[PDB]
Design a protein around this ligand. Structure first.
Ligand code: W90
Length: 130
């Protein structure tokens, strides 16, 4: 839809602080911090797929809006995720060990903007079309 495409990370703010708040250790934060992944979003019927590709780590999720699914995250959390579409924003919540984090993906001019919140930390990542 508005989201379908191949997207390249161009800017990131507060990602280390976000990863620290999730409990990610030094080595994994170090491998994630300077990475510039591609995000590839596609849709087939009811099923949306989001691939994240980077030199040292790839991940993929496929889901139906409003249907909880199990996910292994790039930092190896085993989470339960639910993704909904609210006002044109794709809103993902991940739940694990009594904690939650929310990841919101929105389209703003030429940008795919991703806002990641864990407790008091808010990280913003900006992608542009490859
Ligand atoms: C939602 C998220 C936290 C942020 C975003 O979508 O931008 C997911 C993300 O970036 N995962 C990720 C990061 C690296 Cl560095 C490499 C690989 Cl494979 C995956």
């Amino acid at each position: 839809d508005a989201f379908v495409g191949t997207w390249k990370l161009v800017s990131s703010e507060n990602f280390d602080d976000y990863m620290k708040e999730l409990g990610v250790g030094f080595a994994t934060r170090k491998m994630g911090g300077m990475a510039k992944p591609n995000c590839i979003i596609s849709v087939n019927g009811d099923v949306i797929t989001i691939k994240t590709e980077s030199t040292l780590k790839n991940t993929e999720i496929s889901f139906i809006l409003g249907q909880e699914f199990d996910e292994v995250t790039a930092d190896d959390r085993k989470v339960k995720s639910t993704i909904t579409l609210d006002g044109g924003v794709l809103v993902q919540v991940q739940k694990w060990d009594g904690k939650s984090t929310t990841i919101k993906r929105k389209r703003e001019d030429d940008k795919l903007v991703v806002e990641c919140v864990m407790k008091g930390v808010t990280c913003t990542r900006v992608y542009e079309r490859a």
